[PDB]
């Protein structure tokens, strides 16, 4: 309390440098602070969430301002396919003149950075056209962040502090959040689309000054209240429409065309409008479900209690889970993180194949960057979901209240779960690695016709069920006699079939034996990471080796060398181990995506179709082949604009290597070395005049694991980001 860790006495009284490290590392864990009550915990969390919102909005405002100030948004808008967007300017005093010449891209007057976030396409699609629009948005977002800061400060005041019962009103919070935050927000977005952005793509200009007089439709709101909702879809945009101009432009606002806009190769705007309108209606209806102050609606506890199978196969069913979830913040955090990870993976998978932004899918580097970014985010989020679930088992789980319900019966057959997961992982690993090595041996001996190439007929059958007429399966949407084809042949199927039978886009790419092998390696990675995380979560409360782990908390180094040795015994260590597998799996996924799309964009898909069936093919035709321009960023003959990416590549290799030092070498060596260093310092003339305040010590065991994992992950991310950006920007194809 006296010293820096004001929230911890044990850390405050520590005389070593461990105090600073652990005060930093445990600052944002409010349940562990001294004299912490539930009410203070909830209010502090609520204010911190306000602060996070303010930070997010300031980040967006900064992007907008820097693009409006130093970017060529208007020049890019004039010629989207021939101008490189500008992220921010460069002012580095350490440059030399050749670098200043090399980084002057775009139409800029000085060195700049080319943007790969895709915000140009997103802002252009939603109606923003000039720099004044971006400036207005930046100022507005500054105001919004200020509003959230004021809100946090106010709702922390004694008069305005909410009570603990307010934070536990699940039905009312879910009712408002589901109705407003989802349905009304999507309804407002549909309003923006219809009222502003659709006219922009047809050569109109609608702003705040003429919003009240510019009709979205020639006969506005007449048919809507007359029941003639089909009037708004009469005249869609033509296939010869030019985005941003009135050439071949329709007047419909809610079409249901399906497919892609031919000029921009993205989804129609009116499709997106009807989509967000339907989503808004569904969410607003779904909000009016749970009971509140008006005496109608369902009650979530009664729903959980009623659902319980007779015959006792599930035990007591979902009984008692309401209080377990309401009183545990870690259970809620785990559920939210799992859902968010699934949703992020969905975003990544569904954005590369159905691009929503005009001019995207022609900026190859942006597409690759977006995919990799959100996929790595999803992986980290999933690992966090499992970690905070393990924290729930250790901290908030009460065995007596969850007597014989589903939650306890999960702990009941945990050995069966872990055993069958181990079997699945072993099976996938053995037979997949065996097939890869067998193919390697076959091609090494000069006989590539002896390799085991298995056709992925299930995924091909699914593709044919979608209407792809390449594999000759002739089922469902591929069959003209099917009821589904006849039912959909007028609403959405023309455009959808035209898009899915095109072999130039990324909508249901053609697949072969290599794709089969890679999806199987991905399945191996998923089941193995799940094995590690589930083993950590279920064995968190105790095992045969240490039956009282729940008394030692979530994170602790070990239990000593007794009983054979107990290194890496806590559930935190299972998190630590599973992070490596998560990184490896996401690496496999991104490697596969990037190589397939490189071959697609160069037009040479045969190289992937032939070289992906063996591992030497990967190592030779992906990495070594595509690292040429990257490693030639700077050489004894000068430097290119890829110099920064080459430097980042080497930087990532170096940081990743440095992480190994913390990962492999442990503490006692370093502690003794520091002891010798302290002796040396105390005995040196002109240096004894200076004394340390904190006694130097080596890092803790858990701290060493964390620092090694951090250096490792940073090196991983920076290396792959540099390689991806350079290998896709050197060619742009």
């Amino acid at each position: 309390a006296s010293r820096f860790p004001k929230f911890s006495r044990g850390l405050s009284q520590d005389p070593t440098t461990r105090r600073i490290w652990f005060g930093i590392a445990t600052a944002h864990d409010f349940e562990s602070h001294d004299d912490m009550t539930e009410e203070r915990l909830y209010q502090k969390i609520f204010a911190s969430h306000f602060g996070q919102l303010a930070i997010i909005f300031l980040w967006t405002s900064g992007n907008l301002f820097h693009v409006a100030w130093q970017g060529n948004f208007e020049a890019w808008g004039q010629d989207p396919l021939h101008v490189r967007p500008i992220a921010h300017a460069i002012w580095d005093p350490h440059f030399g003149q050749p670098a200043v010449e090399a980084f002057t891209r775009g139409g800029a007057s000085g060195p700049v950075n080319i943007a790969y976030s895709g915000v140009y396409q997103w802002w252009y699609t939603i109606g923003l056209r000039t720099n004044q629009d971006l400036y207005g948005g930046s100022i507005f977002l500054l105001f919004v962040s200020a509003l959230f800061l004021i809100a946090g400060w106010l709702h922390l005041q004694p008069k305005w502090k909410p009570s603990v019962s307010w934070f536990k009103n699940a039905e009312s919070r879910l009712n408002h959040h589901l109705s407003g935050l989802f349905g009304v927000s999507s309804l407002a977005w549909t309003g923006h689309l219809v009222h502003v952005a659709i006219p922009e793509s047809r050569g109109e200009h609608v702003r705040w000054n003429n919003l009240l007089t510019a009709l979205p439709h020639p006969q506005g709101l007449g048919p809507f209240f007359a029941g003639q909702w089909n009037v708004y879809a009469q005249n869609p945009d033509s296939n010869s429409h030019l985005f941003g101009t009135s050439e071949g432009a329709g007047t419909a606002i809610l079409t249901f065309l399906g497919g892609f806009h031919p000029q921009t190769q993205s989804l129609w705007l009116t499709d997106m409008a009807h989509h967000h309108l339907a989503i808004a209606v569904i969410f607003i209806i779904a909000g009016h479900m749970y009971r509140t102050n008006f005496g109608i609606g369902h009650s979530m506890k009664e729903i959980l209690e009623a659902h319980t199978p007779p015959g006792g196969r599930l035990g007591r069913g979902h009984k008692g889970l309401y209080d377990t979830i309401n009183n545990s913040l870690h259970f809620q955090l785990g559920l939210a993180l799992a859902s968010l990870g699934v949703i992020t993976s969905l975003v990544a998978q569904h954005m590369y194949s159905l691009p929503p932004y005009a001019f995207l899918a022609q900026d190859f580097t942006t597409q690759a960057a977006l995919y990799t970014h959100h996929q790595y985010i999803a992986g980290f989020i999933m690992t966090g979901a499992f970690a905070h679930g393990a924290i729930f088992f250790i901290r908030d789980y009460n065995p007596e209240q969850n007597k014989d319900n589903v939650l306890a019966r999960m702990l009941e057959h945990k050995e069966a779960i872990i055993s069958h997961l181990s079997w699945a992982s072993l099976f996938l690993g053995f037979h997949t690695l065996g097939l890869y090595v067998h193919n390697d041996v076959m091609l090494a001996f000069g006989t590539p016709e002896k390799q085991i190439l298995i056709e992925p007929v299930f995924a091909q059958w699914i593709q044919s069920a979608h209407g792809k007429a390449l594999y000759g399966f002739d089922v469902l949407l591929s069959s003209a006699d099917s009821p589904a084809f006849n039912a959909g042949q007028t609403l959405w199927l023309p455009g959808w079939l035209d898009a899915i039978n095109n072999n130039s886009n990324s909508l249901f790419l053609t697949i072969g034996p290599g794709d089969f092998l890679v999806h199987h390696a991905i399945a191996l990675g998923l089941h193995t990471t799940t094995l590690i995380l589930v083993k950590g979560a279920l064995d968190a409360r105790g095992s045969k080796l240490m039956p009282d782990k729940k008394e030692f908390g979530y994170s602790f180094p070990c239990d000593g060398p007794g009983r054979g040795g107990t290194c890496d015994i806590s559930a935190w260590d299972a998190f630590y181990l599973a992070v490596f597998w998560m990184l490896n799996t996401i690496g496999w996924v991104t490697f596969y995506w990037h190589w397939k799309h490189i071959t697609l964009w160069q037009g040479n898909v045969a190289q992937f179709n032939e070289s992906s069936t063996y591992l030497m093919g990967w190592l030779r035709d992906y990495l070594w082949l595509n690292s040429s321009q990257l490693i030639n960023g700077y050489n004894p003959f000068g430097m290119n604009s890829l110099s920064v990416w080459a430097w980042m590549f080497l930087f990532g290799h170096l940081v990743w290597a440095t992480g190994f030092m913390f990962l492999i070498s442990w503490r006692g060596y370093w502690q003794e070395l520091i002891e010798t260093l302290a002796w040396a310092h105390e005995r040196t003339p002109l240096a004894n005049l200076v004394r340390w305040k904190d006694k130097p010590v080596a890092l803790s065991i858990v701290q060493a694991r964390l620092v090694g994992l951090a250096h490792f992950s940073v090196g991983y991310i920076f290396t792959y980001a540099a390689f991806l950006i350079a290998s896709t920007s050197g060619k742009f194809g």
Binding site: D396, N398, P399, E551, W679
Partner: protein
């Protein structure tokens, strides 16, 4: 038993080392171990090196309690020598520590009271969720 005092007894014959006392002894506690030898013998210093113990009383300054106890354990198991050690503070306060009541800790002695004993098995401890928002640790109960 009446705890013993300290006096001016000779130190063992040692030629010096870099493993001796540091500024911690100056600004914090340091430890002194005393023993009696029947003859001069060579023993290994806990700080590294070999020393000769005098015939009669001996006195040795050490930086940690573990060093004193390791040297005393070696003396007892190898030379059959009884020993004492104390704790010295910078202001001059002396604290007698190892044979607290004159009997070594591995021998049961009357007048000792249990400390930290729990009257249950280790499997009967409570759950961390039961003692939520309380300062207990489920092993202090």
């Amino acid at each position: 038993t009446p705890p013993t005092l300290n006096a001016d007894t000779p130190a063992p014959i040692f030629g010096g080392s870099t493993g001796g006392l540091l500024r911690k002894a100056q600004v914090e506690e340091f430890y002194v171990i005393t023993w009696e030898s029947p003859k001069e013998q060579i023993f290994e210093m806990p700080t590294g090196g070999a020393a000769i113990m005098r015939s009669g009383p001996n006195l040795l300054k050490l930086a940690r309690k573990e060093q004193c106890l390791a040297l005393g354990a070696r003396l007892r198991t190898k030379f059959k020598i009884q020993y004492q050690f104390y704790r010295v503070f910078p202001n001059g306060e002396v604290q007698y520590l190892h044979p607290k009541d004159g009997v070594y800790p591995e021998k049961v002695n009357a007048g000792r009271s249990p400390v930290g004993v729990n009257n249950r098995s280790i499997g009967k401890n409570a759950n961390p969720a039961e003692l939520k928002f309380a300062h207990k640790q489920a092993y202090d109960l």
